[PDB]
Amino acid sequence: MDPFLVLLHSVSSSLSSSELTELKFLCLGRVGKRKLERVQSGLDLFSMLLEQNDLEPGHTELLRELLASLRRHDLLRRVDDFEA
Amino acid sequence: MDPFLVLLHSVSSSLSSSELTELKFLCLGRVGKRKLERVQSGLDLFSMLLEQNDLEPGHTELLRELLASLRRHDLLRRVDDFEAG
Amino acid sequence: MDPFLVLLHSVSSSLSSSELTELKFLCLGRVGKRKLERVQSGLDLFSMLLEQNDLEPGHTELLRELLASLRRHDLLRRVDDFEAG
Amino acid sequence: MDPFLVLLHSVSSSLSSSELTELKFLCLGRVGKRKLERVQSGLDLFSMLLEQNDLEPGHTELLRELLASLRRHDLLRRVDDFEA
Amino acid sequence: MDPFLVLLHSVSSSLSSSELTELKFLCLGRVGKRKLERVQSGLDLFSMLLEQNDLEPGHTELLRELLASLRRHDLLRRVDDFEAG
Amino acid sequence: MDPFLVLLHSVSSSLSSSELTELKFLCLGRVGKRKLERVQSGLDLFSMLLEQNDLEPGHTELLRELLASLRRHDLLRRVDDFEAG
Amino acid sequence: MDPFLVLLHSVSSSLSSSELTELKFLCLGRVGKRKLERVQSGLDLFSMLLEQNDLEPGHTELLRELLASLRRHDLLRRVDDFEAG
Amino acid sequence: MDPFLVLLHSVSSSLSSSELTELKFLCLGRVGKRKLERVQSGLDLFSMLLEQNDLEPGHTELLRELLASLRRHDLLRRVDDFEAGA
Amino acid sequence: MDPFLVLLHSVSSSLSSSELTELKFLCLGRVGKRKLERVQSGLDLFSMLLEQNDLEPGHTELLRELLASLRRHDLLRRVDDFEAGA
Amino acid sequence: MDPFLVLLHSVSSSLSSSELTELKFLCLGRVGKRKLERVQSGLDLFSMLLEQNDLEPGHTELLRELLASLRRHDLLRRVDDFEA
Amino acid sequence: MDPFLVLLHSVSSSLSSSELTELKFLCLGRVGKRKLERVQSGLDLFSMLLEQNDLEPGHTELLRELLASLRRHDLLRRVDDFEAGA
Amino acid sequence: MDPFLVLLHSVSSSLSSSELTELKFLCLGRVGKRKLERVQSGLDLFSMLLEQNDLEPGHTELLRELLASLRRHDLLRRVDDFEA
Amino acid sequence: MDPFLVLLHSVSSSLSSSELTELKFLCLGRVGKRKLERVQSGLDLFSMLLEQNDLEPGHTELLRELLASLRRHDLLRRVDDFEAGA
Amino acid sequence: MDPFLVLLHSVSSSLSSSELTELKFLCLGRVGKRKLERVQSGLDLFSMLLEQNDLEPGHTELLRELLASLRRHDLLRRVDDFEAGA
Amino acid sequence: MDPFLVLLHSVSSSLSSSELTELKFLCLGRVGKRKLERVQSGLDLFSMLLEQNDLEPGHTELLRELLASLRRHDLLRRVDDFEAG
Amino acid sequence: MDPFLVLLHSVSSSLSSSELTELKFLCLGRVGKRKLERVQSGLDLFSMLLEQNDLEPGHTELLRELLASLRRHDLLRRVDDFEA
Amino acid sequence: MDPFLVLLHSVSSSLSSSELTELKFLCLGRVGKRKLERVQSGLDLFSMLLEQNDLEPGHTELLRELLASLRRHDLLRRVDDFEAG
Amino acid sequence: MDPFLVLLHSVSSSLSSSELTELKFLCLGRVGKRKLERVQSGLDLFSMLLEQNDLEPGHTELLRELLASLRRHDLLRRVDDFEAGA
Amino acid sequence: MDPFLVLLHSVSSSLSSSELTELKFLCLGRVGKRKLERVQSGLDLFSMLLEQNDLEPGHTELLRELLASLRRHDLLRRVDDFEAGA
Amino acid sequence: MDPFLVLLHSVSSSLSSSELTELKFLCLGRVGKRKLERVQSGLDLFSMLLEQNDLEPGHTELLRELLASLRRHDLLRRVDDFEA
Amino acid sequence: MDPFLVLLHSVSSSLSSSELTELKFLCLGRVGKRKLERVQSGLDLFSMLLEQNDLEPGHTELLRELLASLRRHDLLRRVDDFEA
Amino acid sequence: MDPFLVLLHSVSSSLSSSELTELKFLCLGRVGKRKLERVQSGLDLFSMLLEQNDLEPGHTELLRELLASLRRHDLLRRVDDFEAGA
Amino acid sequence: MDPFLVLLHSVSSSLSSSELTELKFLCLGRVGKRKLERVQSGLDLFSMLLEQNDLEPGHTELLRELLASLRRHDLLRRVDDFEAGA
Amino acid sequence: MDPFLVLLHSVSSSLSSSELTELKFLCLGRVGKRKLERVQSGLDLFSMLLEQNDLEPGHTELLRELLASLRRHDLLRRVDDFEAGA
Secondary structure, eight states: OOHHHHHHHHHHTTOOHHHHHHHHHHTTTTSOHHHHTTOOSHHHHHHHHHHTTSOBTTBOHHHHHHHHHTTOTTHHHHHHHHHO | OOHHHHHHHHHHTTOOHHHHHHHHHHTTTTSOHHHHTTOOSHHHHHHHHHHTTOOOSSOOHHHHHHHHHTTOHHHHHHHHHHHHO | OOHHHHHHHHHHTTOOHHHHHHHHHHTTTTSOHHHHTTOOSHHHHHHHHHHTTSSOSSOOHHHHHHHHHTTOHHHHHHHHHHHHO | OOHHHHHHHHHHTTOOHHHHHHHHHHTTTTSOHHHHTTOOSHHHHHHHHHHTTOOOSSOOHHHHHHHHHTTOHHHHHHHHHHHO | OOHHHHHHHHHHTTOOHHHHHHHHHHTTTTSOHHHHTTOOSHHHHHHHHHHTTOOOSSOOHHHHHHHHHTTOHHHHHHHHHHHHO | OOHHHHHHHHHHTTOOHHHHHHHHHHTTTTSOHHHHTTOOSHHHHHHHHHHTTSOBTTBOHHHHHHHHHTTOHHHHHHHHHHHHO | OOHHHHHHHHHHTTOOHHHHHHHHHHTTTTSOHHHHTTOOSHHHHHHHHHHTTSOBTTBOHHHHHHHHHTTOTTHHHHHHHHHHO | OOHHHHHHHHHHTTOOHHHHHHHHHHTTTTSOHHHHTTOOSHHHHHHHHHHTTSOOSSOOHHHHHHHHHTTOHHHHHHHHHHHTTO | OOHHHHHHHHHHTTOOHHHHHHHHHHTTTTSOHHHHTTOOSHHHHHHHHHHTTSOOSSOOHHHHHHHHHHTOTTHHHHHHHHHHHO | OOHHHHHHHHHHTTOOHHHHHHHHHHTTTTSOHHHHTTOOSHHHHHHHHHHTTSOBTTBOHHHHHHHHHTTOHHHHHHHHHHHO | OOHHHHHHHHHHTTOOHHHHHHHHHHTTTTSOHHHHTTOOSHHHHHHHHHHTTOSOSSOOHHHHHHHHHTTOTTHHHHHHHHHHHO | OOHHHHHHHHHHTTOOHHHHHHHHHHTTTTSOHHHHTTOOSHHHHHHHHHHTTSOBTTBOHHHHHHHHHTTOHHHHHHHHHHHO | OOHHHHHHHHHHTTOOHHHHHHHHHHTTTTSOHHHHTTOOSHHHHHHHHHHTTOSBTTBOHHHHHHHHHTTOHHHHHHHHHHHHHO | OOHHHHHHHHHHTTOOHHHHHHHHHHTTTTSOHHHHTTOOSHHHHHHHHHHTTSOBTTBOHHHHHHHHHTTOHHHHHHHHHHHHHO | OOHHHHHHHHHHTTOOHHHHHHHHHHTTTTSOHHHHTTOOSHHHHHHHHHHTTOOBTTBOHHHHHHHHHTTOHHHHHHHHHHHHO | OOHHHHHHHHHHTTOOHHHHHHHHHHTTTTSOHHHHTTOOSHHHHHHHHHHTTSOOSSOOHHHHHHHHHTTOHHHHHHHHHHHO | OOHHHHHHHHHHTTOOHHHHHHHHHHTTTTSOHHHHTTOOSHHHHHHHHHHTTSOOSSOOHHHHHHHHHHTOHHHHHHHHHHHHO | OOHHHHHHHHHHTTOOHHHHHHHHHHTTTTSOHHHHTTOOSHHHHHHHHHHTTSOOSSOOHHHHHHHHHTTOHHHHHHHHHHHHHO | OOHHHHHHHHHHTTOOHHHHHHHHHHTTTTSOHHHHTTOOSHHHHHHHHHHTTOOBTTBOHHHHHHHHHTTOHHHHHHHHHHHHHO | OOHHHHHHHHHHTTOOHHHHHHHHHHTTTTSOHHHHTTOOSHHHHHHHHHHTTSSBTTBOHHHHHHHHHTTOHHHHHHHHHHHO | OOHHHHHHHHHHTTOOHHHHHHHHHHTTTTSOHHHHTTOOSHHHHHHHHHHTTOOBTTBOHHHHHHHHHTTOHHHHHHHHHHHO | OOHHHHHHHHHHTTOOHHHHHHHHHHTTTTSOHHHHTTOOSHHHHHHHHHHTTOOBTTBOHHHHHHHHHTTOTTHHHHHHHHHHHO | OOHHHHHHHHHHTTOOHHHHHHHHHHTTTTSOHHHHTTOOSHHHHHHHHHHTTSOOSSOOHHHHHHHHHTTOHHHHHHHHHHHHHO | OOHHHHHHHHHHTTOOHHHHHHHHHHTTTTSOHHHHTTOOSHHHHHHHHHHTTSOBTTBOHHHHHHHHHTTOHHHHHHHHHHHHHO
C-alpha cells in the first residue's frame, strides 16, 4: 500500500466533528461551497485537496499549518515520524 | 471560450440545495412544472432560461434580481466585474 | 417578476419549525396526510395552497387568519403594505 | 392549428409523475393492461382516449371528473376559459 | 367513473409510509417477495389484490380487517358510507 | 367470427412483459428454442399451441393450468364464462 | 371513382402495425396460412376479402365486427357516414 | 376430381417458406440437387414424389412421417379423415 | 359472337400466374405432360378441355368445381349470370 | 416532343413504390388483374389508361382525382401550370 | 388506293402478340384449325375474313365487336372517322 | 444550395426527442397515423409538410406557430434572420 | 391397331423436353450425330431404334434400362402391365 | 405440465435483487461474463444451468449448496417436499 | 388473516428504541452485520428470523427467551394466550 | 467508317434498361406498337429513327431533346464535340 | 427416412442466432467467405459440411468438438444416444 | 487508376447512416424521388451527381458545401490535399 | 448400355447453376467463346470434351481436377468406385 | 489451305451474338438491308466483304478498325501475328 | 463450488458502509475513479481485484493488509483457517 | 498504438458523471443539441471534437482550458508530460 | 489447367457483395455502363478485363492496386506466392 | 480445429459492452467508420483485424497492447499459455 494513504487514514481516524467543522471553515477559500456540503469526514476533504495538488508526498506545509491551527501537537509527531 | 458560460458556471458552483429550492420557487411562473421537476443544479435552470431568451449577454436584469432576492452580495460583485470589462 | 411570489417568500423566510408545525396542524382539513408528510418549509405549503386555489392575489383571507392565529402581528403589516400598493 | 390540441398540450405540460400514476390508476377500467404499460406522459393517455371516443371538442365530462379528483382547480379554470 | 376505484383512491391518499410498511408486513402470505419490492404506495398493493380476486365490490372483508388492525376508525366510516348507499 | 379466437385475443390483451416471460419459461418443454425466439406477444404463442393441438375449444386444461400458475384469477372467470355459455 | 374503394383506402391509411397483426390473427379461419404471409398493409387483406365475397358494398358486417374488436370507435363513425349518406 | 389431388392441394396451401425449406432438407436423399433447385412450393415437390412412386393413394407413410417431423398435428387429422373414406 | 367464348375470355382475363399453376396441378389426370408444358394462359387450357369434351355450353360442372377449389366466389356469380340469362 | 408525354414522364418520375401500390389499388375497377400484374412503374399504368381513352390532353379529371387522393398537392400545381 | 385496305393496315399495325392470340381465340368458331395455325399477323386473319365475306366496306359490325371486346377504344375512333368520312 | 433547406436542416439539428414527440402530437390532424409511425427526426416531418404544401418559402406561419408552442424563442430569431 | 405401337405412343406422350435431351445423350453410342440432329419427339427416336432391331415386341430390355435411369417408375408399371397382358 | 419447472418458477418468484447479485457472484466460475451480463431474474440463470447439465431432476446438489449459502432454510423445505413425493 | 402475524404485529407495536437495540445486541450471533445495519423496527428482525426458520408457529422458544431477557412479563401473557387457543 | 455511326454506337453503349424504357415511352407517337415491341437496345431504335429521316448528320435536335429529358449531360458534351 | 438427417434436424432446431454466429466464426477456415454469406440457419452449414465430406454417419468428431466449444451438453447426449443404438 | 475515383472512395468510406440521410435531404432539389429511393451508400449519390455534371475533377464546390454543412473539417483537408497536387 | 455415359449422367445430375458457371469459367482456354454460349447443363460440356478427346474412359484426370477445384469430395468417390469396379 | 481463310475462321470462332449485331450495325452503309438479313455468323459477313474487295490479304484496315471499335484487343494481336 | 469464493462472500457479508468507504479510500491508486463509483458492496471491489490479478488463492497479502488496517482481527482468523 | 489516443483514454478514465455534466455545459456552443444527447462518457465528446478539428496532437489549448476550469490540476501534469516526452 | 485461371478463381471465391460493388465503382472508366449491369460475381469482371488486355499473366499491376484499395492484404500474399512460383 | 480461433473465441467470450466500446475507440485509426459501425461483438473486430493482417498466429503484439490497456491481466495469462505450449 502507499505509506502516504495509510498516514492520512490514521490522521483522519483521530478527529471529532467539531474539529471537522473548524477545518471546513479554514478551507473556505480553496474549495467551493457546493462541494463542501458533501464532506462528512476527513477523507473526502483530503481527496479533494489531493486532486487540487494542494497535498503531495513531499509537500506537507498546508497539513502542518492546519494541524498547528487546531492545536493538535500529537499528530504532528506522527507526521514528522513519517517524514523522517 | 465563451466568457458568459464561464461566468454562469462560476456562479452556479457556489450555491447550496436550499438556495436552489428558493430559486425554483421564485421561477415558478416562467417554467412549467414538468420541466422544473428535472432540475438538479443551477446549470439546468440557466440552460432553460437561455433557451427561452430570458438570459442574454446584454440582458442580465433577471439574474441580478434573483441574486439580490437571495441576499448574496458577493456574486453581484462578480457579475459587475464581468459586465465592466 | 411577480411581487406576490416575493411577498410569500419574504413571509416564509421569517418562520421557525414550531410555527410550521402549528400551521400544519391548522391546515389538517384541507390537505391530505400523504401530501402533508412531504412539507419541510413554508414554500411547499404555499405551493399546495396556490394549486388548490385557496390562496390568490386578490383573496388573501386564509393567510391573514393563519397569521392572526399564530399571534404574528409584524407580518400582517407587510401584507397590508402589499395590498395598499 | 386546432385549439383543442393546444389546450390538451397545455394541460399535459403541467403534470408531474405521481399525478400521472394516479390518472393511470383511475383509468383502469377503460384501457387494457398492455396499452397502459406504454404510457409515459399525458399525451399518450389523451391520444388513446381520443381514439376510443371518450374525449371530444363538445364532451369534456371525463376530463373534468379526473381533474376534480386530482384536486387541481387552476386547470379547471383553463378548461372553463376554453369552453367559453 | 367507477365509484369503487374512487373509494380506493381516497383511502390510499390518507396513509403514511409507516402504515404502508405495516400493511406490507400483514400481507406476507398472499403476495410473493419479488412483487412486494415494487410497492411504493397503496395503489400498487390494491391493484395486486384486485388481480388476485381478494378485493371485490361485494367482498370488502379483508380491507376492513386490515383497517381495523391499523386502528384507523375514521376510514371504516368511509367504507360503511360507501356500502350503505 | 369465431368466439374462441375472440376469447384468446381478449385474454392476450391483458398480459404484460414479465408474465409473457414467465409463460415462455413454463412452456420450455413443448416449443423449441428457435421458435420461442420469435415470440413477442401472446398471440404467437397461442398460434403455435393451436398448431400443435395442445389447445382446442373442447380442451382448455393447459391454459387453465398456466393461468393458475400466474395467480391470475380474474381471467379464469372469463374462461368459465365462455365455457358455461 | 368508386366511393367504396375510397372509403377502404381512407380506413386502411389509419392503422399501425400492431393493429394489422391483430387483424391477421382474427382472420385466421377464413384465409390460408400461405396467403397471409404476403400481407403487409390493409389493402392486401381487403382485396382478399373482396375476392372471397366476404366484403361487399351492401354487406359490411365483418368490417364493423373487426373494428369493434379493435376498439376503434372513430372509424365506425366513418363507416356510418358512408352508409347513411 | 381426384379426392387425392384435392387433399394434396389443401395440405400444400397451409405451409410457409421455412417449412418448405425443412421439407426440402429432409427429402435430400431421394431427389437430386438440380431438380430440388426448381421447387418453389409444395405442389412442385409432391409432383416429383408422385412420379417416383413414393406417394400413392394407398401408401401414405412418407407423408405422415414428414408431417410428424414438422410437428403439424392438425394436418394429420385431415389425412386421417381422408383415409377414413375407405 | 358466341356468348360462351366471351364468358371464357372474361374468366381467363382475371387470373394470375399462381392460380394458373394451381389449375394446371388440379388437371394432372386429364391432360398429358407434354401438352401441359405448352400452357401459358387460361385460353390454352380451355381450348384443350373444349376439344376433349370436358367443357360444353350446357355442361359446366368441372369449371365450377375448379373455381370453388380456387376459392374465387366472384367468378361463380358471372357463371350463374350466364347460365340464367340463356 | 409532345407536351403531354413530357408532363406524364415528369409526374411519374416523382413517385415511390407505396404510392404505386395505392394507385394500383385505386384503379382496381378499370384494369384487369392479369394486366395489373405487369405494372412496375407509372409509365405502364399511364399507357394502359391512355389506350382505354380515360386520359386525354383535354380530359384530365381522373389524374387530378388520383393525385388529390394521394395528398400530393405539389403535382397538382404542375398539372395546372400545364393546362394554363 | 382502296381506303378500306389502308384502314385495315393501320389497324393491324398497332397490335401486339397477346392481342393477336386473343383475337384468334375469339375467332375459333368461324375459321378452321388448320387455317388458324398459319396466322402470324393480323393481315392474314383479315384476308381470311374478307374471303369468307365477313368483313365488307359497310358491313363492319364484327370488327367493332372484336375491338370492343379487346377494350381498344382508340381504334374505334379510327373506324368511326373512316365511316363518317365516306 | 437552396437557403430554405439549409435553414430547415439547421432548425432540425437543434431539437431533442421529447420535443419531436410534442411536434408529432401537435400535427395529428394533418398527417395520418401510418405515416407518422415512420418519423424518427425533424427532417422526415419537414419533408411530409413540404409535400403537402403546408411549408413553402413564402408561407412559414405553421412553423412559427409550432416553434412558439414549443417555447423556443431562439430559433424564431433564426427564422426572422432568414426572412429578412 | 398394333398394341406395341399404342404402348409406344402412350409412353412418348408423357415426356418433357429435358427428359428427351437426357435420352438423346444416353443413346449417343448407338445413333449417329446427323440422325440425332433430326429428333424432335420420342416417336422419332423410337422409329430409329425399331429400324435397327434394338426394340422388339419380345425384347424390351433397353427401354426398361432407359426408364430406370430416368427414375420414372410409373412407366415401368405400364410396361409390366403390357407384358403381362400378352 | 412438468413439476420440475413449476418448482423452479416457485423458487425464483421468492428472491429479491441483492440475493440475485449474490447468486451471480457465487456462479462466477461456471458461466461467462458476457452471458452473466444478461441475467435479470432467476429464470435466466436457471435456464443456462439447465443447458450446461449442472441442474437435472435428480442432480440437485448445486441448488442446495446455493440455497444453504444464502441462509434460506424455508426454500430447502420446498425442495425436500418435491423430492419426497417422487 | 394469519393469527401469528397479528400476534407478531401486536408484540412489535409495544417496543421502544432501547429495547430494539438490546434485541439487536442479543441476536448478534445469528444475523450478519450488513443485515442488522438495516433493522429499524421489530418487524424487520422478525422477518429475518422467520426466513431463517428460527421462529415458527409451533416453536416459540427463542421469542420467549428474548422476551424474558428484557423482563417484559406482560407480553408473555399474550404469547401464552395465543398458544392456549 | 462514317463518324455518325460511331457516335451513335458510343452513345448506345452507355444506357441501361430503365433509360431504354423511358426512351421507348417518349417515342410513343412516332413509332408503332408492333415495331416498338421488337426493340431490345438503342441500336434498333436508332435504326428505326434513321429509316424515317428523323435523325440526320445535320439535324440532331430530337437526339438532344431526348438526352436532355433523360437528364444525361455527359452525352450532350459528346454530341457537341462531334458537331464542332 | 434417414436417421442421420432426422438427428441433424433435431440438433439444428435448438439453436439461436448468437450460437449460429459463433459456429460460423469457428468454421472460418473450412468454408469460403462467399458461401458463408448465404448461411441463415444450421441446415445450410450442415449441408455444406456434408458436401465437403467433413460430416459422415460414422465420423462425427467435428460436430462433437463444435458442440463442446458452444458448451451445449444436452445435445452431446443426443449424439451419444444416436451412436449407442 | 484515376485519382478522383480513389478520393471519392476514400471520402465515402468514412460516413455513417445519419450523415447519408442528411445528404439525401440536402440534395432534394437535384435528384428525383424515385432515384433517391435507390441510394444505400455514398457511391450511388456520387455516381448520380457525376452523371448530371455537378461533380467534376476541376469543379468541386458542391462537395465542399455539403462537407461544410455536415461539419466535417477533417475531410475538407483531404479535398485540399488532392487539389494542391493537381 | 455404356457405364461411362451412365456415370457422366449421374455426375451431371448433381450440379447447380453456380457450379456450372464456375466450370465454364475454368474451361475457358479449351472451348471457344461461341461454343460456350450454347451450354445449359453439364451434358453439353461433357459432349464437347468427349469430341475434343480430352475425356476418355481411361483418362479422367481433367474431371478429377475440376471436381477437386469445386471442392466436391463426394463425387470423387463415385469416380473412384467406377474406376475400381472396372 | 490459305492462311488468310484460317485466320478469318479463327477470328469468327470467338464472337457472340451481341458482337455480331454491333458489327451488322457498323457495316450498315456497305451492305444492303436484304443481304444483311441473311447473316447469322461472321463467315457470311466476311464472305460478303470479300466479294466487294473491301477485305484483302494486303488491306486489313477495316477489320482492325472494327475490332478496335469492339474493344477486342486480344484479336488485334492475332491479326498482327498473322501479318508479321 | 470454489472454497475461495465462499470465503470472499463470507468476509463481504460482515462489513458495514463506513468500512466499505475506508476500503474504497485505501484502494485509490489501483482502481480508476470511474470504476470506483459503481461499487456499492464488497463483492464488486473483490471482483475488480480478482480481474486485475491482485487476489489469487495463493496470494492473499493485500487482503490481510486491508483487514489489519481496518483493525478487524476476527476476520484474519477466518482467513488463516481457510489457508490452513 | 497512437500515443495520443492512449492519452485521451487515460484522461477519460479518471472522470465522474458530474464532471461530464459540467464539460457538456461548457461545450454547449460547439456541439449541437441533438448530438450532445448521445454522449455517455468522455470518449464520445473527444471523438466529436476530433472530427470538428478542435483537438489535434499539435493543438491542445481547448483541453487545457477545460481541465483548468474543472480545477483538475493532476491531469494537466499528464498532459504536460505527454507534450514534453514527444 | 492454367495456373492463372485457378488463381483468379481462388481470389474471386473470397469476396462479398459490398466489395464487388466497390470494385464495380472503381472501374467506371474502363468498362461501359451497359456491360457493368451484367456483372454478378468477380469472374465476369475478370473475364472482361482479360478480354480488354488489362490483365495478363505477366502484368498484374491493376489487380494489385485494386486489392490494395480494398485493404485486403491476405490476397496480396497469394498473388506474391503465385508470382514467385512462376 | 485451429487452436488460434479457439483462443480468440475464448478471449472474446469474456468481455462486456463498455470494454468493447473502449476497444472500438482504441482501434480508431486502423478501421474505417462505416466498418466500425457494424461491430457488435469482439468476433467482428477480430475478423477485420485478421483480414488486414494485423493479427497472426506468429504475431500477437497488438492484442497484448490492447489487453494491457484494458488492465485485464487474467487473459494475458491465457495468451502466454497458448504461445508457450505451442
